[PDB]
Amino acid sequence: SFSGYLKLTDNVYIKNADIVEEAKKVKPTVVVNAANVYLKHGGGVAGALNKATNNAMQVESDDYIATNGPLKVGGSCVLSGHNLAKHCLHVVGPNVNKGEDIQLLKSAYENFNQHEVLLAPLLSAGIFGADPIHSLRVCVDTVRTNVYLAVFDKNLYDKLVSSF
């Protein structure tokens, strides 16, 4: 039920959209969160996704962390998608603004391959400091499953498409 996506490759599609609004209309099987190792959903996609669940995502995330400890950079966990999706795949991409190794971005994208279809943001772009053009490149070169990328910024969306 994804509509208005531009085809980039056989399995990668892209749209200028807010991933929260896209998730509510579609209610996909998997929505990807741009998470940190602590699952503290304060800003960016994480804060926007959590706010849409009335904080139910954060309460569930704190219980997960209390039992399992923090995730690894490049790692992921599957939790409830609440009112946005069946599941939320919380993926930790490297935060370049915190000195984390950009090489871990491919490892972060590999988590996508465990799911047939996903609605996702561009990993490590935004407040994480990675180059969004590099992030799209790693995505197309790593994900083999069907991924629908939601890019919030119109001017970034245009730049991404015109340079692909």
Ligand X SMILES: CNC(=O)c1cc2c(N[C@H](c3ccc4c(c3)OCCO4)C(C)C)ncnc2[nH]1
Q: Which residues bind ligand X (CB under 6 A)?
A: 18-20, 34, 44-45, 48, 121-122, 125-128, 150-153, 156
Q: What is the CA radius of gyration of the chain?
A: 14
Instruction: Using the minimum distance from each CB to ligand X, give the nearer residue, 60 or 153.
Output: 153
Q: How far is the CB of 48 from ligand X (least distance, A)?
A: 4
Q: How far is the CB of 66 from ligand X (least distance, A)?
A: 24
**Lookup: tokens for 152:** 């919030």
Instruction: Using the minimum distance from each CB to ligand X, give the nearer residue, 14 or 79.
Output: 14
Give the CB-nearest residue to ligand X: 44
Distance (Å, rounded) from C-alpha 134 to C-alpha 41?
24
How much helix, strand and coil, in percent to the nearest 5, is found in the chain? 40, 20, 40
Q: How far is the CB of 76 from ligand X (least distance, A)?
A: 14
67: which residues sit within 8 A by CB, 6+ positions away?
A: none
Q: How far is the CB of 38 from ligand X (least distance, A)?
A: 14
* First-residue to last-residue Cα distance in the chain: 25
Instruction: Using the minimum distance from each CB to ligand X, give the nearer residue, 22 or 87.
Output: 22
74: left (phi over 0), alpha (psi -120 to 50) or beta: left
Instruction: Using the minimum distance from each CB to ligand X, give the nearer residue, 79 or 105.
Output: 105
